[PDB]
């Protein structure tokens, strides 16, 4: 299941289970736009910033 | 209900606005002191979907990712403030401007409006007014038994009475110049009013630091170039054709989905 | 379930995206300094079936749209404030929040306190302050904005219009109102004078028109409509096959 | 929408400029000390779809590639400062210049 | 989405490129020293299918197999470097070339372009420059109190001063000739830059080695023949209509394939 959903605290959960990355469970900055990459790299953009 | 239909609808509306501007420009050909208008369009937003520049892979990034655009929308209509060609009407009261100034009139409400048209008349009380009856500042009073009214290049209005070899000065016609001339709000009736984007009205003598020279017996016709309007009409018609075809194509696609 | 509905659906969505790109190109046919967009389609993952060799597809997905940065045609505005670019270069315009965007629309105006701004009112870097009693504004080929005043027989130098050049012009982010912001794929905004270091020249009194060719868009609309019909027929065939299966 | 349309549009403006110059010259026939105008035109942008001289192969070079051009633009409208014919009005206050001077 | 439609797409776009060539030639009819362009087209790909020449029946070959081809692509646009008609304007500063030479001009960025337009002007410092303000090379400087400027057909420039009955040579106007004149890259403003397909610039004074002869008071008008342009209009229109007809026929075939 690739339907990944963000939380208000910013952690990545799939069906309520936090997603596991290379640093353990993945925590993403709150209120950011995410672009998963062909190798799973997660890029975070803060709205308003260039 | 479908995105392409909204985009094509916006395109159709923009082309209709362009045609409206063209028709307004062509309808005011015979208007004196008229400036032709040109509309400028911008695109509307851009759906993000895939953020370009994101990491496509651990060592590589996405070059120019997937952006989906919306339709188009008109930004603004800018006037072309250029000296309309002059015309000799051989009238002592018609005044034309050679430079970049405006005449000031008072509306009945007490506020001040600005007009470039110089077709002036005299009212029953002897004051110089415009064709709409608005009193032109600075309120030059023409006396009862005038023989000839002389308006010079620097804005002096003189009246030559009977049996007097010297002319009697009865006023001083000044011109108002703005920092942003296109920012004035046109209320119709050949009248523009000051807005906050048009700076402040700077009064000046007609011949000084940049006010134009006043010509008596001349009228400034409109600057509308008509061949350009015909070519632009052809362009607008073809663009409206293509946008309507896009609408029809979208209509044909949704039909097959309904049939499914 | 497992079938071909999704393949055909992913196909339709691709035709929808292509039609959206075409409609965006056609709607902006009157914008000054607009680069047409082209959507690139490139298929999804493949499922491999092992023998005791064959690979089944999954559909098609849009990857990235490219803006074609060719030099558009010039048209006439006889307005002294409008400048078009001959070559590759971008005007730098300061947004109210503080970050500088980059535009190619050369239709400019002077605001209430001097200052050269774009049609949307945003101020244009490098900042120009036009004097009030200016008689004629002359913008040279190399970006020198000189102003003539009544009396003085020599024009007064006011400012230089610098062009910002990017090494990758396609990667700029289109923020909306005819403005681009630099991105990680179009980094290092190189400020230069117009005419040197690959920067373009400036034509005063001309504006750069859109890059949208019409015939390509119309024939592409024909192709999109017909491919959409084909994918709809495939969806209907899968629907009928599943209907026949369920009735057993 | 079509490049050919823009190119023709310019050409039309250029010819209208030529017509206006001719009309202005004819309107000032009887005026003294007049210098007739003349408009000069130049090539507009040139789209380099295929670069002339591009190295198509390691040995052959493409001669005179696809240089699609845009319309035309008037460079300027220059006045022809030449000595007009002298005419005798026989007034003491009328003066004429023979060379290339100007009254201040 | 279907081969015939792609082939017809190349067709429409290429007849447009023609149309652009025609329009560019027409817009520059009044341009001095202009050369008309002509586009050349080539065949696109040819799908092999059945190979022509492959042996069938062991001892009989197959002649002319299925060489199904794709559309058309324009090879290049070549300028017709022919002598335009000379027009007399009776000016000391207009120079016309009658042979096969080019004037050399220095761009302020450091490089040198080549122009054939001979309408020259004088800047405030007395240098001979082009009408766009670009300074001609070698570098003809004209004295302040010049009474008459004489440019010979050998390219020598003489100025007649007051109190001197003998003209003084103030420069020498040279012509640049190339191996291939079509390979120059036109950058606009009647300027050509040297490319690697146009060889190298060969300096020669006017009258020797082939450089042409310079006429004073004459301008080399454009060589555009306009009736040929109208006949080319009529084709560029009929061919485009027929290609659009092919597009329509393919569209109908696909529509019936879809509807079944």
CSV table of C-alpha atoms in Angstrom, one decimal, chain E residues 18-209:
chain,number,residue,atom,x,y,z
E,18,UNK,CA,7.3,28.1,-46.8
E,19,UNK,CA,4.7,30.6,-45.8
E,20,UNK,CA,7.0,32.1,-43.3
E,21,UNK,CA,9.7,32.4,-45.9
E,22,UNK,CA,7.3,34.1,-48.3
E,23,UNK,CA,6.1,36.5,-45.5
E,24,UNK,CA,9.7,37.3,-44.5
E,25,UNK,CA,10.6,38.1,-48.1
E,26,UNK,CA,7.6,40.3,-48.5
E,27,UNK,CA,8.1,42.3,-45.3
E,28,UNK,CA,11.6,43.3,-46.4
E,29,UNK,CA,10.7,44.6,-49.9
E,30,UNK,CA,11.6,48.1,-48.9
E,31,UNK,CA,14.8,47.1,-47.0
E,32,UNK,CA,18.0,48.2,-48.7
E,33,UNK,CA,20.5,45.5,-49.4
E,34,UNK,CA,18.2,42.6,-48.6
E,35,UNK,CA,18.4,39.1,-50.2
E,36,UNK,CA,15.4,36.9,-50.6
E,37,UNK,CA,15.3,33.4,-49.1
E,38,UNK,CA,14.2,30.1,-50.5
E,39,UNK,CA,13.6,26.9,-48.5
E,40,UNK,CA,14.7,23.4,-49.6
E,41,UNK,CA,12.8,20.3,-48.5
E,42,UNK,CA,13.9,16.6,-48.3
E,43,UNK,CA,12.2,13.3,-47.7
E,44,UNK,CA,11.9,11.9,-44.2
E,45,UNK,CA,12.4,8.3,-43.2
E,46,UNK,CA,11.5,5.2,-45.3
E,47,UNK,CA,10.4,2.1,-43.4
E,48,UNK,CA,12.1,-1.0,-44.9
E,49,UNK,CA,9.4,-3.7,-44.5
E,50,UNK,CA,10.1,-5.9,-47.6
E,51,UNK,CA,13.7,-5.3,-48.5
E,52,UNK,CA,14.2,-4.4,-52.2
E,53,UNK,CA,16.8,-6.7,-53.6
E,54,UNK,CA,16.3,-9.7,-51.3
E,55,UNK,CA,16.2,-13.0,-53.1
E,56,UNK,CA,12.8,-14.6,-53.4
E,57,UNK,CA,12.5,-18.1,-55.1
E,58,UNK,CA,16.3,-18.8,-54.7
E,59,UNK,CA,17.0,-17.3,-58.2
E,60,UNK,CA,14.6,-14.4,-58.5
E,61,UNK,CA,15.1,-11.1,-56.6
E,62,UNK,CA,12.4,-8.8,-55.3
E,63,UNK,CA,12.4,-5.4,-57.0
E,64,UNK,CA,11.1,-2.3,-55.2
E,65,UNK,CA,9.8,-3.7,-51.9
E,66,UNK,CA,7.6,-1.8,-49.4
E,67,UNK,CA,9.6,1.4,-48.8
E,68,UNK,CA,6.8,3.1,-46.8
E,69,UNK,CA,8.0,6.6,-46.1
E,70,UNK,CA,7.4,9.2,-43.5
E,71,UNK,CA,6.7,12.9,-44.2
E,72,UNK,CA,8.9,15.9,-45.2
E,73,UNK,CA,11.5,18.0,-43.4
E,74,UNK,CA,13.0,21.3,-44.7
E,75,UNK,CA,16.7,21.0,-45.3
E,76,UNK,CA,17.7,24.6,-45.1
E,77,UNK,CA,16.9,28.2,-46.3
E,78,UNK,CA,19.4,29.6,-48.8
E,79,UNK,CA,19.7,33.3,-49.7
E,80,UNK,CA,19.8,34.3,-53.3
E,81,UNK,CA,22.8,36.6,-53.4
E,82,UNK,CA,22.1,38.5,-56.6
E,83,UNK,CA,22.6,42.2,-57.5
E,84,UNK,CA,19.6,44.3,-56.5
E,85,UNK,CA,18.4,47.2,-58.6
E,86,UNK,CA,20.3,50.4,-57.8
E,87,UNK,CA,18.2,53.4,-56.8
E,88,UNK,CA,19.5,57.0,-57.0
E,89,UNK,CA,18.8,59.1,-53.8
E,90,UNK,CA,21.4,61.8,-54.6
E,91,UNK,CA,23.2,61.6,-51.2
E,92,UNK,CA,26.9,62.0,-50.4
E,93,UNK,CA,26.6,59.2,-47.7
E,94,UNK,CA,24.7,56.4,-49.6
E,95,UNK,CA,27.1,53.8,-51.0
E,96,UNK,CA,26.0,51.0,-53.3
E,97,UNK,CA,27.9,47.9,-54.1
E,98,UNK,CA,27.6,46.6,-57.7
E,99,UNK,CA,29.6,43.4,-57.4
E,100,UNK,CA,30.0,40.8,-54.7
E,101,UNK,CA,31.5,42.5,-51.7
E,102,UNK,CA,30.5,43.3,-48.1
E,103,UNK,CA,31.2,46.2,-45.8
E,104,UNK,CA,32.9,45.3,-42.5
E,105,UNK,CA,31.3,46.7,-39.3
E,106,UNK,CA,32.5,46.4,-35.7
E,107,UNK,CA,30.0,45.5,-33.0
E,108,UNK,CA,30.8,47.2,-29.7
E,109,UNK,CA,31.2,43.9,-28.0
E,110,UNK,CA,34.4,43.4,-29.9
E,111,UNK,CA,33.5,41.1,-32.9
E,112,UNK,CA,32.9,42.2,-36.5
E,113,UNK,CA,29.8,41.7,-38.6
E,114,UNK,CA,29.3,42.3,-42.4
E,115,UNK,CA,26.6,44.5,-44.0
E,116,UNK,CA,25.7,45.4,-47.5
E,117,UNK,CA,23.3,48.3,-46.7
E,118,UNK,CA,25.2,51.4,-47.6
E,119,UNK,CA,23.2,54.2,-45.9
E,120,UNK,CA,25.9,55.6,-43.7
E,121,UNK,CA,25.7,58.4,-41.1
E,122,UNK,CA,28.2,60.5,-39.1
E,123,UNK,CA,28.2,60.4,-35.3
E,124,UNK,CA,29.0,63.4,-33.1
E,125,UNK,CA,32.7,62.6,-33.3
E,126,UNK,CA,32.8,62.5,-37.1
E,127,UNK,CA,33.1,58.7,-37.7
E,128,UNK,CA,31.3,56.9,-40.5
E,129,UNK,CA,28.8,54.6,-38.8
E,130,UNK,CA,25.8,52.5,-39.9
E,131,UNK,CA,22.2,53.8,-39.4
E,132,UNK,CA,22.0,51.6,-36.3
E,133,UNK,CA,25.0,53.4,-34.8
E,134,UNK,CA,27.6,50.7,-35.5
E,135,UNK,CA,31.0,52.0,-36.5
E,136,UNK,CA,32.2,51.0,-40.0
E,137,UNK,CA,35.8,49.6,-40.3
E,138,UNK,CA,38.5,50.3,-41.3
E,139,UNK,CA,37.5,53.6,-39.6
E,140,UNK,CA,36.6,56.7,-41.8
E,141,UNK,CA,36.9,59.9,-39.7
E,142,UNK,CA,35.4,63.0,-41.4
E,143,UNK,CA,36.7,66.4,-40.4
E,144,UNK,CA,34.5,69.0,-38.7
E,145,UNK,CA,34.1,71.7,-41.3
E,146,UNK,CA,33.5,69.4,-44.3
E,147,UNK,CA,32.0,71.0,-47.4
E,148,UNK,CA,31.7,67.9,-49.6
E,149,UNK,CA,32.4,64.2,-49.2
E,150,UNK,CA,33.4,62.2,-52.2
E,151,UNK,CA,33.5,58.4,-52.1
E,152,UNK,CA,35.2,57.1,-55.3
E,153,UNK,CA,34.4,53.7,-57.0
E,154,UNK,CA,37.8,52.5,-55.7
E,155,UNK,CA,36.7,53.1,-52.1
E,156,UNK,CA,38.8,56.1,-51.4
E,157,UNK,CA,37.2,58.9,-49.4
E,158,UNK,CA,38.0,62.6,-50.0
E,159,UNK,CA,36.9,65.7,-48.1
E,160,UNK,CA,36.9,69.2,-49.6
E,161,UNK,CA,38.0,71.8,-47.0
E,162,UNK,CA,37.7,75.5,-47.3
E,163,UNK,CA,40.8,77.3,-48.6
E,164,UNK,CA,42.1,74.0,-50.1
E,165,UNK,CA,41.3,73.4,-53.8
E,166,UNK,CA,42.7,69.9,-53.5
E,167,UNK,CA,40.7,67.2,-51.7
E,168,UNK,CA,42.4,65.3,-48.8
E,169,UNK,CA,42.1,61.6,-48.5
E,170,UNK,CA,40.8,60.7,-45.1
E,171,UNK,CA,40.4,56.9,-45.4
E,172,UNK,CA,39.9,53.9,-47.7
E,173,UNK,CA,36.7,51.9,-47.8
E,174,UNK,CA,37.3,48.2,-48.3
E,175,UNK,CA,35.1,45.3,-49.2
E,176,UNK,CA,35.0,41.9,-47.6
E,177,UNK,CA,34.5,38.8,-49.8
E,178,UNK,CA,33.8,35.2,-48.8
E,179,UNK,CA,34.2,31.8,-50.3
E,180,UNK,CA,30.5,31.1,-49.6
E,181,UNK,CA,28.2,34.0,-49.2
E,182,UNK,CA,25.2,31.9,-48.2
E,183,UNK,CA,26.9,30.6,-45.1
E,184,UNK,CA,26.9,34.0,-43.3
E,185,UNK,CA,24.6,34.0,-40.3
E,186,UNK,CA,22.1,36.8,-40.5
E,187,UNK,CA,21.7,38.4,-37.0
E,188,UNK,CA,19.2,41.0,-38.1
E,189,UNK,CA,19.9,44.7,-38.5
E,190,UNK,CA,21.1,43.9,-42.0
E,191,UNK,CA,24.2,42.3,-40.4
E,192,UNK,CA,25.9,39.0,-41.1
E,193,UNK,CA,28.3,37.2,-38.8
E,194,UNK,CA,31.0,34.9,-40.2
E,195,UNK,CA,30.5,31.1,-39.7
E,196,UNK,CA,32.7,28.1,-40.4
E,197,UNK,CA,30.6,27.3,-43.5
E,198,UNK,CA,31.3,30.7,-45.0
E,199,UNK,CA,35.1,30.4,-45.0
E,200,UNK,CA,37.1,33.4,-43.7
E,201,UNK,CA,36.9,37.1,-44.4
E,202,UNK,CA,39.0,38.2,-47.5
E,203,UNK,CA,39.7,41.9,-47.5
E,204,UNK,CA,39.9,43.5,-50.9
E,205,UNK,CA,39.7,47.1,-52.1
E,206,UNK,CA,36.8,47.8,-54.6
E,207,UNK,CA,37.8,46.8,-58.1
E,208,UNK,CA,40.3,44.0,-57.7
E,209,UNK,CA,40.1,40.2,-56.8
